[PDB]
């Protein structure tokens, strides 16, 4: 399992509110990070998952938690999808494009026979350590509220190590 391992170096292009940016492991150092993987933009499935995260992004940013949704689509497609979907539009966190699949593979989250990333969320702490992993099949939704609970729980354990109960 990748639980308790340090994330690997990466460099991708992303679409963050209006423009294109470059994201690397450097950007994550010192912060808490959520890497939200999903299969593909413009598919027929409602972007509820990405939208719920979007709804709680102000709260996440309070907690000092950066969000990076990731898929193998290009940042170009993210821009087009962003400015064409009610839900996707709400997103203010960076939308990473991973066409080489390297980031997706870094997190061993590639559906190799489809070239698409699996539905997985990774919580990474300031030191780069993965502290929570969640992966679900199509249809089984990922709850933003539960994600927030885990992040708070993880943030607490980092402040109060060895909390017997």
Q: Which residues bind Na ion (CB under 5 A)?
A: 72, 99
Near its own copies by CB under 8 A: residue from 26, 45, 61, 64: 45
Per-residue DSSP letter, 92: -
Catalytic residue (choose from 46, 63, 135, 157): 46
In angstroms, the CA 86 to CA 136 distance is: 24
46 classed as catalytic: yes
Near its own copies by CB under 8 A: residue from 80, 89, 106, 126: 80
At residue 44, the 3 state secondary structure works out as coil
User: What are the CB-based long-range contacts (under 8 Å, 24+) for 57-60?
Assistant: 57/91, 57/92, 57/93, 59/148, 60/34, 60/148, 60/151
CB of 101 to Na ion, least distance (A): 7
Near its own copies by CB under 8 A: residue from 23, 34, 73, 91: 73
Nearest in space to 13 (alpha carbons), one of 91, 90, 73: 73
Near its own copies by CB under 8 A: residue from 17, 61, 84, 127: 84
CB of 35 to Na ion, least distance (A): 18
Nearer to its own copies, 62 or 160 (CB): 160
Give residues 116-155 in contact with its own copies (rule: CB under 8 A): 116, 118-120, 123, 129, 131-141, 143, 146, 149-150, 153-154
41 token code pair: 């933009």
Give CA torsion, residues 72, 123, 6, 38, to 10 deg: -10
Cα 131-23-114 angle, rounded to 5 deg: 75
Residues at the contact surface with its own copies, assessed by CB under 8 A: 1, 3-4, 40-46, 48, 72-74, 76-77, 79-81, 84, 98-101, 108-116, 118-120, 123, 129, 131-141, 143, 146, 149-150, 153-154, 156-157, 160, 162-165
Residues marked as catalytic: 46
């Amino acid at each position: 399992s990748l639980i308790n391992t340090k994330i690997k170096p990466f460099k991708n292009q992303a679409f963050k509110n209006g423009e294109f940016i470059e994201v690397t492991e450097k950007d994550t150092e010192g912060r808490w990070s959520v890497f939200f993987f999903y299969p593909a933009d413009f598919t027929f499935v409602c972007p509820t998952e990405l939208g719920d995260v979007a709804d709680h992004y102000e709260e996440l940013q309070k907690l000092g938690v950066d969000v990076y949704s990731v898929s193998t689509d290009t940042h170009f497609v993210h821009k087009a999808w962003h400015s064409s979907s009610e839900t996707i539009a709400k997103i203010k966190y960076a939308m990473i494009g991973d066409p080489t699949g390297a980031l997706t593979r870094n997190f061993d989250n590639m559906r190799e026979d489809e070239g698409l990333a699996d539905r997985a969320t990774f919580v990474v702490d300031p030191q780069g350590i993965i502290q929570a992993i969640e992966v679900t099949a199509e249809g089984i939704g990922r709850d933003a509220s539960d994600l927030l609970r885990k992040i708070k729980a993880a943030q607490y354990v980092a402040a109060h190590p060895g909390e017997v109960c």
